Motif scaffolding. Structure first.
Motif, PDB file in Angstrom:
ATOM      1  N   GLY A  70       0.829  -1.191   0.000  1.00 30.52           N
ATOM      2  CA  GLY A  70       0.000   0.000   0.000  1.00 30.52           C
ATOM      3  C   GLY A  70       0.868   1.247   0.000  1.00 30.52           C
ATOM      4  N   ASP A  71       1.993   1.163   0.701  1.00 26.64           N
ATOM      5  CA  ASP A  71       2.923   2.274   0.798  1.00 26.64           C
ATOM      6  C   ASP A  71       3.496   2.583  -0.589  1.00 26.64           C
ATOM      7  OD1 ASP A  71       4.353   1.273   4.060  1.00 26.64           O
ATOM      8  OD2 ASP A  71       2.448   2.240   3.537  1.00 26.64           O
ATOM      9  N   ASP A  72       3.779   1.528  -1.350  1.00 26.82           N
ATOM     10  CA  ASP A  72       4.352   1.685  -2.685  1.00 26.82           C
ATOM     11  C   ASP A  72       3.308   2.252  -3.652  1.00 26.82           C
ATOM     12  OD1 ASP A  72       6.899   0.501  -1.812  1.00 26.82           O
ATOM     13  OD2 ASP A  72       5.963  -1.482  -2.076  1.00 26.82           O
ATOM     14  N   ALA A  73       2.071   1.780  -3.545  1.00 27.58           N
ATOM     15  CA  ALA A  73       0.999   2.347  -4.361  1.00 27.58           C
ATOM     16  C   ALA A  73       0.827   3.840  -4.037  1.00 27.58           C
ATOM     17  CB  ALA A  73      -0.297   1.578  -4.158  1.00 27.58           C
TER      18      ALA A  73
ATOM     19  N   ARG C  16      -6.621   6.503   7.355  1.00 28.04           N
ATOM     20  CA  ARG C  16      -6.589   5.861   6.053  1.00 28.04           C
ATOM     21  C   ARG C  16      -6.219   6.904   5.010  1.00 28.04           C
ATOM     22  NH1 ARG C  16     -12.133   3.896   3.770  1.00 28.04           N
ATOM     23  NH2 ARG C  16     -12.369   6.144   4.192  1.00 28.04           N
ATOM     24  N   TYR C  17      -6.867   8.064   5.069  1.00 30.13           N
ATOM     25  CA  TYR C  17      -6.627   9.094   4.068  1.00 30.13           C
ATOM     26  C   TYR C  17      -5.178   9.578   4.162  1.00 30.13           C
ATOM     27  CZ  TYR C  17      -6.763  13.602   1.734  1.00 30.13           C
ATOM     28  OH  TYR C  17      -6.524  14.664   0.894  1.00 30.13           O
ATOM     29  N   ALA C  18      -4.737   9.842   5.390  1.00 30.56           N
ATOM     30  CA  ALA C  18      -3.411  10.367   5.661  1.00 30.56           C
ATOM     31  C   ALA C  18      -2.350   9.484   5.046  1.00 30.56           C
ATOM     32  CB  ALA C  18      -3.203  10.483   7.192  1.00 30.56           C
ATOM     33  N   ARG C  19      -2.502   8.173   5.249  1.00 28.40           N
ATOM     34  CA  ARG C  19      -1.533   7.188   4.778  1.00 28.40           C
ATOM     35  C   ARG C  19      -1.554   7.129   3.255  1.00 28.40           C
ATOM     36  NH1 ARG C  19      -2.238   1.868   4.342  1.00 28.40           N
ATOM     37  NH2 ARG C  19      -0.517   0.532   3.630  1.00 28.40           N
ATOM     38  N   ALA C  20      -2.736   7.203   2.661  1.00 27.45           N
ATOM     39  CA  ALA C  20      -2.816   7.080   1.217  1.00 27.45           C
ATOM     40  C   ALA C  20      -2.220   8.327   0.569  1.00 27.45           C
ATOM     41  CB  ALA C  20      -4.262   6.882   0.785  1.00 27.45           C
ATOM     42  N   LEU C  21      -2.410   9.476   1.217  1.00 23.69           N
ATOM     43  CA  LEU C  21      -1.989  10.747   0.641  1.00 23.69           C
ATOM     44  C   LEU C  21      -0.499  10.932   0.761  1.00 23.69           C
ATOM     45  CD1 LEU C  21      -2.767  13.693  -0.566  1.00 23.69           C
ATOM     46  CD2 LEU C  21      -2.725  14.407   1.855  1.00 23.69           C
TER      47      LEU C  21
ATOM     48  N   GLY D   6     -11.050   2.149  -7.930  1.00 26.91           N
ATOM     49  CA  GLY D   6     -11.654   2.301  -6.620  1.00 26.91           C
ATOM     50  C   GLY D   6     -11.660   0.973  -5.880  1.00 26.91           C
ATOM     51  N   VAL D   7     -11.494  -0.116  -6.625  1.00 27.72           N
ATOM     52  CA  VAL D   7     -11.376  -1.438  -6.026  1.00 27.72           C
ATOM     53  C   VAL D   7      -9.972  -1.621  -5.450  1.00 27.72           C
ATOM     54  CG1 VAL D   7     -11.154  -3.908  -6.580  1.00 27.72           C
ATOM     55  CG2 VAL D   7     -13.167  -2.612  -7.397  1.00 27.72           C
ATOM     56  N   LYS D   8      -8.970  -1.486  -6.315  1.00 27.87           N
ATOM     57  CA  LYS D   8      -7.577  -1.623  -5.907  1.00 27.87           C
ATOM     58  C   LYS D   8      -7.268  -0.597  -4.824  1.00 27.87           C
ATOM     59  CE  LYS D   8      -3.338  -3.297  -7.131  1.00 27.87           C
ATOM     60  NZ  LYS D   8      -2.847  -4.678  -6.841  1.00 27.87           N
ATOM     61  N   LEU D   9      -8.009   0.505  -4.858  1.00 29.58           N
ATOM     62  CA  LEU D   9      -7.907   1.566  -3.871  1.00 29.58           C
ATOM     63  C   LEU D   9      -8.307   1.066  -2.494  1.00 29.58           C
ATOM     64  CD1 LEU D   9      -9.317   4.938  -5.207  1.00 29.58           C
ATOM     65  CD2 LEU D   9      -7.109   4.457  -4.142  1.00 29.58           C
ATOM     66  N   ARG D  10      -9.530   0.553  -2.404  1.00 27.97           N
ATOM     67  CA  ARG D  10     -10.004  -0.085  -1.186  1.00 27.97           C
ATOM     68  C   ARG D  10      -8.983  -1.143  -0.783  1.00 27.97           C
ATOM     69  NH1 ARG D  10     -13.195   3.157  -0.014  1.00 27.97           N
ATOM     70  NH2 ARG D  10     -14.891   3.986  -1.348  1.00 27.97           N
ATOM     71  N   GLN D  11      -8.698  -2.066  -1.697  1.00 24.98           N
ATOM     72  CA  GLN D  11      -7.727  -3.119  -1.427  1.00 24.98           C
ATOM     73  C   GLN D  11      -6.499  -2.541  -0.735  1.00 24.98           C
ATOM     74  OE1 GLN D  11      -8.303  -6.372  -1.695  1.00 24.98           O
ATOM     75  NE2 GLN D  11      -6.273  -6.827  -0.823  1.00 24.98           N
ATOM     76  N   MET D  12      -5.770  -1.706  -1.466  1.00 28.98           N
ATOM     77  CA  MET D  12      -4.511  -1.135  -1.003  1.00 28.98           C
ATOM     78  C   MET D  12      -4.577  -0.410   0.344  1.00 28.98           C
ATOM     79  SD  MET D  12      -1.837  -1.902  -2.989  1.00 28.98           S
ATOM     80  CE  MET D  12      -1.106  -2.021  -4.796  1.00 28.98           C
TER      81      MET D  12
END
Lengths: 126, 33, 128, 32
Positions: A70-73, C16-21, D6-12
């Motif tokens: 997830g970190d890499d994505a 979740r948002y923080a980590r993704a961003l 949005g799927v791979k998004l949720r996944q990840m």
């Protein structure tokens, strides 16, 4: 010839500085260093014999702190969509409406649609 | 390329480098053997 | 309803948002903390026209934005974590790129890429 | 219309949500 303690102790202040710089505050930094020392003492990990003790210590630190998929994505996206990914994330992942994301981002509705548009374009283009 | 940033960074991270090392860190290393 | 009571149910989501961003959970939690402190300290306030969740992300975004920002150490948090590592190992900790490669357990080109990217980020928003 | 995004998004990224918040977060909020 020299105890683990004697080999590493002179480098502790420096990896504490690194850890702090990396994680943004001294508390969090120390926790990570602590975890690294515990794994050494516990023999879960050992200093690479090919590396000076200093280099080997930082290698150990990074062996603990492991990057995930997830970190890499997330980091890919940071590269692909550096100025617009927030608007795409607020809507596609966080489920806000564009009108709500405009409030979150403090910009008008048009600016939000523009951003979403950019991010989608950059993503599509791989 | 050059590395002025490093110098600048070391300047404001001086504090931690000069504080004594947390007893816990050394205690942990003693536990080695 | 205290701040703790209005916001508590939303904290897993902002994380979740923080980590993704921002690239990883450590970096994300850093920004969440800064946000919650801005609020505890009353330096910033939840907009009364917005739901608790929306007003929270509005504040998060504001402090995230402004990090780029104020204070070199804190600006470092705007760099992708893996690029930040490579950059700090060399620029701050004085390891050579080869040594940084050993440390990060990755090949050399990856290391120069990573430092390149951190330089890119610094030139775009962080140094400017 | 390929929205495995949005799927791979949720996944990840969705995992975070089912993790327990750091107490330091509450700590900050408890104190006004």
């Amino acid at each position: 010839p020299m105890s683990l303690l004697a080999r590493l102790a002179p480098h502790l202040p420096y990896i504490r500085r690194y850890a702090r710089a990396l994680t943004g505050d001294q508390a969090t930094g120390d926790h990570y260093v602590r975890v690294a020392l515990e794994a050494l003492a516990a023999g879960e990990l050992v200093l690479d014999a090919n590396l000076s003790p200093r280099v080997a210590l930082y290698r150990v630190f990074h062996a603990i702190w492991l990057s995930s998929a997830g970190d890499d994505a997330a980091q890919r996206l940071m590269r692909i969509a550096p100025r617009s990914r927030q608007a795409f994330l607020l809507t596609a992942l966080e489920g806000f409406t564009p009108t709500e994301a405009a409030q979150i981002l403090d910009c008008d509705f048009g600016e939000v649609e523009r951003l979403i548009g950019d991010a989608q374009a950059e993503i599509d283009a791989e | 390329r050059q590395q002025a940033i490093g110098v600048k960074l070391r300047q404001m991270f001086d504090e931690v480098v000069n504080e004594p090392v947390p007893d816990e860190f050394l205690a942990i290393l003693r536990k080695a053997e």
